[PDB]
Amino acid sequence: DIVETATGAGSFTTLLTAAEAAGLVDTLKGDGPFTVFAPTDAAFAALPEGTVEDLLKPENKEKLTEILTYHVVPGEVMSSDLTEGMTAETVEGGALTVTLEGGPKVNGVSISQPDVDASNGVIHVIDGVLMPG
Fold it and tell me: What range(s) does the FAS1 domain occupy (predicted)?
Protein backbone atom coordinates (compact mmCIF):
# COMPACT_ATOMS: atom_id res chain seq x y z
CA ASP A 1 0.00 0.00 0.00
CA ILE A 2 2.26 2.75 1.30
CA VAL A 3 5.21 0.74 0.07
CA GLU A 4 3.39 0.48 -3.23
CA THR A 5 3.66 4.26 -3.46
CA ALA A 6 7.47 4.18 -3.34
CA THR A 7 7.26 1.96 -6.42
CA GLY A 8 5.20 4.57 -8.25
CA ALA A 9 4.67 7.77 -6.25
CA GLY A 10 2.03 9.71 -8.13
CA SER A 11 0.52 11.55 -5.17
CA PHE A 12 3.10 10.90 -2.44
CA THR A 13 6.47 11.28 -4.12
CA THR A 14 7.58 13.70 -1.42
CA LEU A 15 7.00 11.47 1.64
CA LEU A 16 5.17 8.17 1.05
CA THR A 17 7.27 7.16 -1.92
CA ALA A 18 10.18 7.18 0.51
CA ALA A 19 8.26 4.82 2.81
CA GLU A 20 9.25 1.72 0.89
CA ALA A 21 12.27 3.49 -0.52
CA ALA A 22 13.43 4.15 3.05
CA GLY A 23 13.61 0.49 3.98
CA LEU A 24 10.07 0.56 5.37
CA VAL A 25 8.63 -1.69 2.67
CA ASP A 26 8.61 -4.74 4.93
CA THR A 27 7.76 -2.47 7.87
CA LEU A 28 4.73 -0.52 6.63
CA LYS A 29 3.34 -3.21 4.33
CA GLY A 30 4.68 -5.93 6.60
CA ASP A 31 1.52 -7.79 7.47
CA GLY A 32 -1.58 -5.98 8.67
CA PRO A 33 -3.75 -2.86 8.32
CA PHE A 34 -1.49 0.11 8.89
CA THR A 35 -2.76 3.65 9.34
CA VAL A 36 -0.51 6.41 8.00
CA PHE A 37 -1.55 10.06 7.96
CA ALA A 38 0.00 10.98 4.65
CA PRO A 39 -0.63 14.63 3.61
CA THR A 40 -1.53 15.64 0.07
CA ASP A 41 1.15 16.69 -2.42
CA ALA A 42 -0.39 20.15 -2.09
CA ALA A 43 0.17 20.17 1.67
CA PHE A 44 3.91 19.74 1.20
CA ALA A 45 4.03 22.58 -1.31
CA ALA A 46 1.69 24.54 0.96
CA LEU A 47 4.24 24.77 3.78
CA PRO A 48 5.98 28.19 3.52
CA GLU A 49 9.62 29.04 4.22
CA GLY A 50 12.23 26.40 3.39
CA THR A 51 10.14 23.63 4.92
CA VAL A 52 9.17 22.40 1.47
CA GLU A 53 12.82 22.38 0.51
CA ASP A 54 13.54 20.54 3.74
CA LEU A 55 10.61 18.25 3.02
CA LEU A 56 12.01 17.78 -0.49
CA LYS A 57 15.25 16.26 0.80
CA PRO A 58 15.45 12.47 1.46
CA GLU A 59 16.74 13.33 4.94
CA ASN A 60 13.24 14.30 6.09
CA LYS A 61 12.05 10.72 5.65
CA GLU A 62 14.89 9.66 7.95
CA LYS A 63 13.51 11.85 10.73
CA LEU A 64 10.00 10.43 10.42
CA THR A 65 11.62 6.98 10.42
CA GLU A 66 13.04 7.40 13.93
CA ILE A 67 9.57 8.41 15.13
CA LEU A 68 7.77 6.18 12.63
CA THR A 69 6.05 4.48 15.57
CA TYR A 70 4.10 7.69 16.23
CA HIS A 71 3.01 7.53 12.59
CA VAL A 72 2.54 3.75 12.68
CA VAL A 73 -0.45 2.19 14.43
CA PRO A 74 -1.57 -1.48 14.08
CA GLY A 75 -5.29 -2.18 13.90
CA GLU A 76 -6.75 1.31 13.63
CA VAL A 77 -10.32 1.58 12.35
CA MET A 78 -11.94 4.91 11.47
CA SER A 79 -14.06 6.41 14.26
CA SER A 80 -17.04 6.54 11.89
CA ASP A 81 -16.71 2.75 11.78
CA LEU A 82 -17.82 2.62 15.41
CA THR A 83 -18.67 5.94 17.06
CA GLU A 84 -18.02 9.62 16.36
CA GLY A 85 -15.58 11.08 18.88
CA MET A 86 -12.62 8.87 19.75
CA THR A 87 -8.81 8.96 19.92
CA ALA A 88 -5.89 7.59 17.95
CA GLU A 89 -3.06 5.98 19.92
CA THR A 90 0.31 5.57 18.19
CA VAL A 91 2.70 2.67 18.78
CA GLU A 92 5.36 5.13 19.93
CA GLY A 93 2.90 6.26 22.58
CA GLY A 94 0.59 9.07 21.55
CA ALA A 95 -3.18 9.32 21.91
CA LEU A 96 -4.62 11.81 19.43
CA THR A 97 -8.20 13.06 19.13
CA VAL A 98 -10.19 11.73 16.18
CA THR A 99 -13.19 13.97 15.51
CA LEU A 100 -15.70 13.68 12.67
CA GLU A 101 -19.06 15.25 13.52
CA GLY A 102 -19.22 19.02 13.94
CA GLY A 103 -16.09 19.29 11.84
CA PRO A 104 -13.75 16.39 10.91
CA LYS A 105 -10.24 16.74 12.33
CA VAL A 106 -7.38 14.97 14.10
CA ASN A 107 -5.28 16.34 16.95
CA GLY A 108 -6.00 19.77 15.49
CA VAL A 109 -5.30 18.81 11.87
CA SER A 110 -8.02 18.21 9.28
CA ILE A 111 -7.69 15.10 7.15
CA SER A 112 -8.20 17.09 3.94
CA GLN A 113 -8.65 13.93 1.86
CA PRO A 114 -9.72 11.04 4.14
CA ASP A 115 -9.15 7.81 2.21
CA VAL A 116 -9.87 5.51 5.16
CA ASP A 117 -9.25 2.33 3.18
CA ALA A 118 -5.63 1.71 2.19
CA SER A 119 -4.20 -0.90 -0.19
CA ASN A 120 -3.15 -2.95 2.84
CA GLY A 121 -4.87 -1.14 5.70
CA VAL A 122 -5.97 2.44 6.37
CA ILE A 123 -4.84 5.80 4.99
CA HIS A 124 -5.85 9.39 5.72
CA VAL A 125 -4.61 12.59 4.07
CA ILE A 126 -3.77 15.57 6.23
CA ASP A 127 -3.92 19.05 4.73
CA GLY A 128 -0.82 19.84 6.77
CA VAL A 129 1.82 17.98 8.78
CA LEU A 130 1.49 15.44 11.60
CA MET A 131 3.67 13.39 13.95
CA PRO A 132 7.04 14.64 15.33
CA GLY A 133 9.87 15.51 12.96
Answer: 1-130
